[PDB]
Structures are given as C-alpha cells and as structure tokens.
Write a protein that binds this ligand. Structure first.
Ligand SMILES: CC/C(=N/Cc1c(COP(=O)(O)O)cnc(C)c1O)C(=O)O
Ligand SMILES: CC/C(=N\Cc1c(COP(=O)(O)O)cnc(C)c1O)C(=O)O
Lengths: 462, 463
C-alpha cells in the first residue's frame, strides 16, 4: 500500500540518469554521473523510510527512543516552557562569543551540567558540531588521539581537521588492541613519555551501529597503567546513552561514577531527548578552549530561545523522573525480545548456518543493562532480502550498507523504543523466524525467497 | 556596563603560572588560552551590554528588529498553534527516517519565494556551506573563490575533492579575471569543457559590508568559459531580508536565479532565528543528500525549528518586513551623510585616524548594506572599542583570528529598530575619539593614553 509506493519510488530513483545528460551542461552532467555511482550499487538515498510515521508499519527503526515525540510528552513540556517566559527574546543576536550570549542559555547549560555531574556545559546545534568543536579545538600539537575505530563520522571529520599529528585507531571495543595502541603510541613519542603532551582517548558510550557498551572502567585502568604521569584525557560520546542508561537517564559516565575521570563528555538531544542539539561537558578550561579555538562554533549563530527551551524541557522530563517508566520498558522489551528469539525452535540452526546473527542478544543476561540497538546480521548476499522481507511484513527497520559501513559489513538495524509493545515484539520474532526458515529450505534444496521475488517483480515493471 | 568590561578584564589575567602540578592536559590547554590573553583577545561571554538596555545596539545581527519587537515570536507561536498536534521529533537523519511532509512543504515555499526550483534545509548557514563544498565539487573541478568567503566555506573547500582551489583579491574583477583565465589555461579538462570551474562568492560580505558585482563576474566567466563549464555559488547570509524587494536577496534582485546554480540563504541574521536553505535544481539537492556526509550523519530538524523559519519567510511574503527594510536604508544613508559631513572627517581620514570605506561613494549605489566596518590605526583599535563601549554604544570588535593579523577593526551594524538620535550620538562619539587621537599625536608625547583607555587601564590595576 504505502509500503509499496515508497519501494517503487526507491526502485525508480536507482535508474541511471547520465545516459540522458549528454546535452546537459557539464556541471549537471558530472553531478548526475556522481549520483549514478551510488545508483549502480542501489544505494541512492532520497526521501527516507517514513512508513512508520503514517501507521502503515511498526516503528523498529526511528531514534525516538523514549517515545517522547510519539506521545507528545515533550511537546507539552516544550509549550509549557515557552509559557513560563512570555515575551522571550527569540533571536540570540549572533555568534556565542560576539553578541549571541544570553542569560537563559547559560542557565540551562549549568542546569544540565548540574544534573549530569559535570562542572560546566556548552550548547551546540547538534552532536556532530559538538564533535567537530572538540577535535578541532582541544587536541594540541604533539598530542595523540587514540580512538575506537567505530567512532562517529563527525569525530572522524574533527580528528582529520585536528592540530594533532598522531591519530591511531584501535579494533572495536578491544581492550587488548586499545592497550597495544596506547603503549606503542607512548613508546614512539618522547613528548608523551616525559609528560609534555597528552593522549586523548575517544570512545562512544553506546555504539550506534553495534549496540555494545564501552568498558570505560577497564579502559581507564589501562590508561593510568600506560601513562603513569596522568597525561591522558578521555572523550565520551554518549549520543545513544543519554536517556537510556543510568538513574533518570544520566548516561553511562555518571552511572559508573566516572564524572571526575572523563575529561570531556558529549550528550546529544537527537535520540532519547526527541529533539536536536547537544552539550559538551567539562571544566571551565575545556569550555573556554571551545569558545576560542573551535572556529566552527566561533563563526555560527548562537542557539535561539526556542531551541534552548526544548532541550531544557527534555532534561526536565528526565530530571523530574517523567522518563523513568519509559526507560525501564526499553529494558523490558529488549530483554523480552532477546528471550523470545533465542527461545524459538530455529534460532540454533539459524545461528550455526549463519542465517541470522544477533551478537547483542548473546550473553545479555550477564550485563547490568541492555541497549535499544539490535543489529540483525544475515548472509551478505541475503541482506537486501532480509530488509525486503521485514519491510513487506510491515516492519520498518533501517538498512545499513555502503557507504554507511564498509562494503562487506551490511546488516539490518532494529531499534527498540519505550512505546513499542510485546505484541509487536512477538510479530518481529515470528517475522524473523519465517525468514530463517525460508533461507534454510532454500539452502537445503538457485531459489529467491518470496519477499525478494515481489521486490524484483516491481523492478521488472519499474 | 562596567561589569561586562571588568569580567573581560579579569579573563585576560594569565593562568599558566598557577598550572604546575596541574595535569599535563589542562596545563597545555590553559597554555593555549594564555596565547590569547597575552594579546588581550580572549573571548568569554561576548558583547551583551545592549541586550538589557544599558547600551545602544549597533552590534547585533538582528537586522530587521524582528527579535527586538517580538514580531517573529508572535508569528512563530501562531504557526505552532495552527498545528496543535505537531510531531516534534524528526525521527532521525533526513535520509534515514527524519523526513516529513511539513519540512518538504516549507522547503518548497522558500524555494518558490526565492525563485529556485528546490530548497534543502540545514541547522545553520555554516552547515550549508560545509555540505556544498564537500558534496558538490567533483575530482578534476577547480574552485575560484573570493578570499573573504566565510570560514565554513574555507573548511568545506579544504575537505573537498577538488584539487585546484584558487583565491582572488576581494571584490576585484581584474583579479578574478586573472584567476579564471590562468586556471583555464593550465587545465586541459577545463579547456575542453569536461570539468567545471566553481565560483564561490558572498553577495554581501560580513566584515567589509560590500556587495559582490555578480552581473560583472557572470559576464567574465562566460567570456573565459565559452563552453559554459562553470557554476556560481552565492552565499547570501547578509542579503536575505535586507536586499531586494520583500527581502528576496541579491540574486533574485538582479534576476539571476537561473544563472547562479547554488544559493545559500541563512536565517541567523535579518530572519532572526537559526538555520539555512541551499537552493538549486533537484540534481544539486540529491547531490547534497548523498555526498554531504555531514548532513547524512546528523539528526533532521525538529518541527519547531522548521516552523520559525516558515514564520520568518511568511513575514517577508506578507510585506511585514518592507518598512523595517526601508528603515535600514534610511538609517545607513543618514549615518553616511552625517559622518562625512562632520568637521574633522577630512582630517581624520587623511591621517588614517578614521576610515570607513563603505561611506565612500555610497550615493553611486542602488542600495547600501547594514554592515559599517570602522577602521582606525591598528594600535588604537581596542582604544576605539573601549571609547565606544564606555559611551554606551555596543559594537563588536574584530581581531585575529576572525581577520588577518594587521586588519583589526570594529563592526557597527545598523538595525531597523535604531533611531536617528542614536546615529547622531554615534557620530558625535566617533568625532570625539578622532579629535582626541589627533591631539595626542600632535602633542608629541608617545605615552599619552586617551581618556576611555585610562579608565580601562585603571580597572585593570584595581582588579
Ligand atoms: C556567526 C555570526 C556571523 N555569521 C556569518 C555568516 C555565516 C554563518 O551562518 P550561520 O550562523 O552558521 O547560520 C555564513 N555565511 C556568511 C556570509 C556569514 O557572514 C556574523 O557575521 O556575525
Ligand atoms: C542521526 C544519525 C545517528 N546518530 C548520530 C550520532 C551523532 C550525531 O548526533 P546529531 O544528530 O548531530 O545530534 C553523534 N554521535 C553518535 C555516536 C551518533 O550515533 C544514528 O545512529 O541514526
């Protein structure tokens, strides 16, 4: 219905366009050639998913983690906040350091900083710009940046534009490789050995595309062991941690009581807090470093009053406890899904054959908590088929593929929200087990499964 | 207020001395901050002295006084009220489930008001320029850009896939002609029309206040690129709302919406909120959605953020900013006649004591802009700022790194909500400073400090 109208528009947008641009001007000629590169691998993005916004599909893909957007709970606290300041000055006035600072944004920052256990906060338009500012301002020449290989794109963009000359990745969440990265970096840099420069460790609290948790206590112990002079500093991107983890959604850093051990923390408002923006946490020296050396911040207009107001409304819902029930239902529904798919008859054969792989679902009971992020892996030549199977079953997931991940690591990303139900989770489990069945029967018989046939049929027409 | 200047005075006291047993990371961080303090140009809280009412606003970016009057606020809240059940959260990135009908419809309203085929909305003008210059240039293309394009344009070009980036002297048609032709003559794939030259300009330049001669550069581009293998990119941050009928900006005013492939219009200035739109055909828009990785990997704008942009443009389309816009023109022409009619103007400008280049031949233009950069001698620049501030006139001082080392100045912004009496006081204050400086220099005492600097140097001693 509405599922099939967007599949058609998606199929149609991958038709190569350059063979029609021979007469077009050179500028548009080469742009449509560049778009054709993506079309050729069927990865041209246009209008997104959105079948869940209309009711035509379950929402297992959006970032509305606590359903604050779905319920209108944030909108009502947002309008209530604007009503506490009639005649508010909407316009900031300019750059935050030249005409754009005002009392209400400083007060909201300190309010948030107090709630998350930090000394100071600085507000950005987004988590991305938060990362851009951190890694263009904070790293000094002679510093070293050691980062998890799956840090966010904005972190990669910030580090590339950094003043630091030494940046070394380490294998994802691997405490051994992080040790090897730390000590091999120390040994070859005499300025780190005598403590005249620092090593900056860059990690995410919860990884957007894997769903696992940074072992921060252990990394901090490794760091102190390698750098006994204390010349290290951590930077924790809690994008997918805020609102999900910790008492009243404070995140992983405060949950572990590391608020004095992690020098820089980024908390974003784009997921659980159901709006946009971010704050960078640190002491007053970090904050003044961003205001003075993060040129991206210096040359952009400061947040408007409504933008600050929606952020404050979201932390209000967190800090007054209004999100606590939604926060536990995530834990419940993720465990409920984990129990249900690992208890179905076919999970064992499908896991050996490699038909389905959900690594976050294994050993889940030994963790202090679970995450909302559940990537589901299949065979790489089955990935689009798994997507079409769920999509045609009226379950909206996010497909992950090149360029978003390396060209061989394709997967499906399922998001469990506080506003989902056990009936919907049962439907997701049953839907996945039908797919695992279909591919095992094909593997035991060149057949193409039902769902893919229908999508390939629509292509043969469009 | 004395308090804002006192706080600024304290923020310049060096701190590296107290940092010994301070850990390496905070010591090196505060050592970098000291580099700014030792030149007295550390920034902390800005210039908000005007915001309360204790100083005249000649500094903010609220050009049409939409923020001051609450006009945009009232329309913004009525727009929210006409959508009582709006979905606040976008859902994710614009290409992954953050798209919705409201933002697309708003985009097309802005495109059609601006005379463009499509529009694409960003969090900021800076993010728009980032997206343009990382997504649009192809390998083999050349970028010819005005040296004074915005910081975000410089960041975007440095992350670009184009391998020839050529700057040219600001607003200079001969320098631009020389950049275009020497770039054309050294690239066989520009000569044969298979790659393109991208031309990057601001319609109104944020710190010199002058206007890009866009019709002249298009003529020169077509001359040097007879195959038409070129494309212009016009950043209109300081034109939207303030230039053209009903604020449509410079490109539409000259009727060049079909000759300028990419346009950036921003909401941080005269439109009194935040955000931007990139304008172009659907090939440009798809290019940004697929190759601007900054856009792909960030959350899509929430409903209230879209609605205030809509309210701003709706104000412009109902003609509710035209009188504010005519007021700007009146007040800037009034400042220009006033200051150049002053007694000391001839002497102060011959001596380089005062210099306002946008005040020269302002009558030979079709319009003026709101940006009045005021120069003095480089060693007097903070003295000029102190003098203006203590006279309760809020201006924004402009020093390294915002500008080159020896190009420090002070930026006055004329807003619609300003008055002729406020302009009279500014001129009187400027003439006092010029007179005080001419006296000090002819008195032959190289240690003589002006009055307003004496007070600042006093508080520095006390505090
Ligand atoms: C930061 C205050 C400011 N910005 C100027 C500016 C921007 C940034 O746009 P945005 O703030 O990211 O929406 C973009 N392009 C031009 C030409 C500009 O002059 C100013 O001139 O005081
Ligand atoms: C919206 C795309 C997305 N994640 C965003 C994200 C950001 C950017 O945050 P912002 O949208 O600029 O505020 C920063 N750090 C991490 C770890 C992230 O995962 C996702 O997983 O769908």
């Amino acid at each position: 219905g509405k599922v099939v109208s967007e599949m058609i528009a998606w199929i149609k947008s991958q038709k190569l366009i350059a063979p029609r641009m021979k007469d077009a001007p050179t500028f548009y000629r080469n742009l449509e050639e560049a778009l054709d590169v993506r079309r050729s691998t069927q990865s041209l993005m246009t209008r997104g998913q959105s079948t869940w916004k209309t009711g035509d599909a379950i929402d297992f893909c959006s970032n509305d983690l606590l359903s604050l957007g779905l319920t209108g709970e944030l909108r009502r606290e947002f309008l209530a906040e604007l009503a506490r300041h009639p005649d508010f000055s909407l316009h900031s006035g300019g750059s935050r350091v030249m005409g754009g600072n005002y009392d209400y944004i400083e007060a909201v920052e300190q309010e948030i900083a107090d709630f998350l256990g930090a000394e100071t906060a600085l507000m950005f338009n987004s988590g991305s710009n938060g990362n851009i500012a951190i890694y263009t301002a904070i790293p000094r020449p002679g510093d070293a940046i050691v980062y998890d290989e799956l840090v966010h794109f904005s972190t990669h963009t910030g580090m590339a534009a950094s003043l630091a000359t030494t940046k070394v990745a380490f294998r994802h969440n691997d405490l051994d490789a992080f040790r090897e990265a730390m000590s091999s970096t120390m040994d070859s840099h005499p300025m780190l050995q005598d403590g005249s420069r620092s090593i900056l460790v860059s990690v995410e609290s919860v990884y957007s595309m894997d769903g696992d948790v940074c072992p921060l206590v252990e990394m901090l112990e490794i760091a102190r062991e390698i750098c006994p002079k204390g010349n290290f500093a951590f930077i924790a991107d809690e994008a997918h941690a805020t609102g999900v983890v910790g008492p009243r959604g404070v995140g992983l850093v405060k949950l572990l009581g590391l608020e004095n051990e992690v020098a820089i923390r980024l908390n974003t408002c784009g997921k659980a807090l159901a709006c946009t923006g971010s704050v960078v946490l640190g002491n007053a020296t970090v904050r003044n470093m961003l205001l003075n050396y993060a040129g991206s911040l210096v040359n952009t207009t400061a947040p408007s009053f409504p933008s600050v107001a929606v952020i404050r409304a979201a932390y209000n819902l967190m800090r007054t406890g209004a999100t606590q029930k939604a926060q536990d239902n995530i834990q419940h529904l993720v465990k409920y899904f984990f129990e249900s798919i690992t208890s179905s008859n076919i999970w064992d054969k499908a896991t050996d054959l490699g038909i389905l792989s959900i690594p976050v679902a294994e050993d889940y009971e030994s963790l202090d908590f679970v995450t909302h992020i559940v990537p589901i892996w299949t065979r790489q030549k089955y990935n689009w088929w798994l997507f079409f199977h769920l999509q045609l079953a009226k379950i909206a997931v996010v497909p992950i593929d090149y360029p978003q991940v390396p060209k061989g690591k394709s997967r499906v990303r399922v998001m469990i929200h506080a506003g989902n139900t056990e009936e919907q989770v049962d439907y997701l489990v049953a839907t996945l087990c039908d797919f695992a069945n279909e591919m095992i029967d094909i593997e035991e018989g060149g057949k193409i499964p039902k769902a893919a046939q229908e999508i390939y049929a629509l292509m043969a027409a469009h």
